């Protein structure tokens, strides 16, 4: 079976960040850059720390190797009521150290970018018990902006696209938001809102398009 895989037979994501407020795990996060993690603007907490290059972790996690947020940035025109424009710069405490366990995530640049088939990333437990949080994987494909204009009606921006699967996920689809939806290896979206974090083809899930936001993104790392 070697190969015949996919990203969700990866024992490790390389690029998925855990955000944690005072000793819980609140959402997803993707590592961009050495110093930047990017997650959705809802998941704003104080005091956010932030855990790279983890499998598994539990609340009050005391595997150390974490990293404190000095600076949050949530785009200035976020809008929580629509949730458009849902997404926040996290500027880590150190660099990471980049490794086999720890790698960034190229942004999609080009909004027109062809590939449809994706997968997403949520921290979730795979079961109903108390085992830890775990990275939960799951495919799923774009649905063109009409179709998700006719789901979620006077709902969905230029700021956001949607995505979902007739499945209904990935018969794992557990997990929570502000996380990743990768396609053809780049990021496209941040889990955002709606039938989250899988959701069908007629409910999807709402990302921010993320391809909206590189100049953003660029102008305030380069700052």
Not at 35 to 58: D, E, I, M, S, Y
Not at 79 to 85: C, E, M, R, V
Not at 129 to 134: L, N, Q, W
């Given at each position: 079976?070697?190969?015949?895989?996919?990203?969700?037979?990866?024992?490790?994501?390389?690029?998925?960040?855990?955000?944690?407020?005072?000793?819980?795990?609140?959402?997803?996060?993707?590592?961009?850059?050495?110093?930047?993690?990017?997650?959705?603007?809802?998941?704003?907490?104080?005091?956010?720390?932030?855990?790279?290059?983890?499998?598994?972790?539990?609340?009050?996690?005391?595997?150390?190797?974490?990293?404190?947020?000095?600076?949050?940035?949530?785009?200035?025109?976020?809008?929580?009521?629509?949730?458009?424009?849902?997404?926040?710069?996290?500027?880590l405490a150190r660099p990471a150290k980049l490794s086999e366990l720890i790698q960034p995530?190229?942004?999609?640049?080009?909004?027109?970018?062809?590939?449809?088939?994706?997968?997403?990333?949520?921290?979730?437990?795979?079961?109903?018990?108390?085992?830890?949080?775990?990275?939960?994987?799951?495919?799923?494909?774009?649905?063109?902006?009409?179709?998700?204009?006719?789901?979620?009606?006077?709902?969905?921006?230029?700021?956001?696209?949607?995505?979902?699967?007739?499945?209904?996920?990935?018969?794992?689809?557990?997990?929570?938001?502000?996380?990743?939806?990768?396609?053809?290896?780049?990021?496209?979206?941040?889990?955002?809102?709606?039938?989250?974090?899988?959701?069908?083809?007629?409910?999807?899930?709402?990302?921010?398009?993320?391809?909206?936001?590189?100049?953003?993104?660029?102008?305030?790392?380069?700052?």
């Open positions: 079976k070697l190969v015949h895989g996919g990203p969700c037979d990866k024992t490790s994501h390389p690029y998925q960040a855990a955000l944690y407020t005072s000793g819980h795990l609140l959402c997803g996060g993707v590592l961009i850059h050495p110093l930047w993690v990017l997650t959705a603007a809802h998941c704003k907490k104080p005091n956010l720390q932030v855990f790279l290059g983890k499998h598994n972790l539990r609340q009050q996690e005391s595997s150390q190797e974490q990293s404190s947020v000095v600076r949050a940035v949530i785009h200035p025109d976020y809008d929580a009521a629509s949730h458009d424009q849902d997404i926040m710069l996290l500027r995530l190229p942004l999609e640049r080009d909004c027109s970018a062809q590939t449809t088939s994706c997968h997403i990333l949520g921290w979730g437990k795979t079961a109903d018990g108390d085992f830890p949080d775990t990275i939960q994987c799951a495919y799923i494909h774009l649905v063109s902006r009409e179709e998700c204009e006719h789901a979620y009606p006077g709902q969905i921006t230029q700021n956001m696209l949607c995505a979902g699967d007739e499945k209904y996920g990935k018969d794992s689809c557990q997990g929570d938001s502000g996380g990743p939806l990768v396609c053809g290896d780049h990021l496209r979206g941040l889990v955002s809102w709606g039938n989250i974090p899988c959701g069908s083809k007629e409910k999807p899930g709402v990302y921010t398009n993320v391809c909206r936001y590189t100049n953003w993104i660029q102008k305030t790392i380069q700052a």
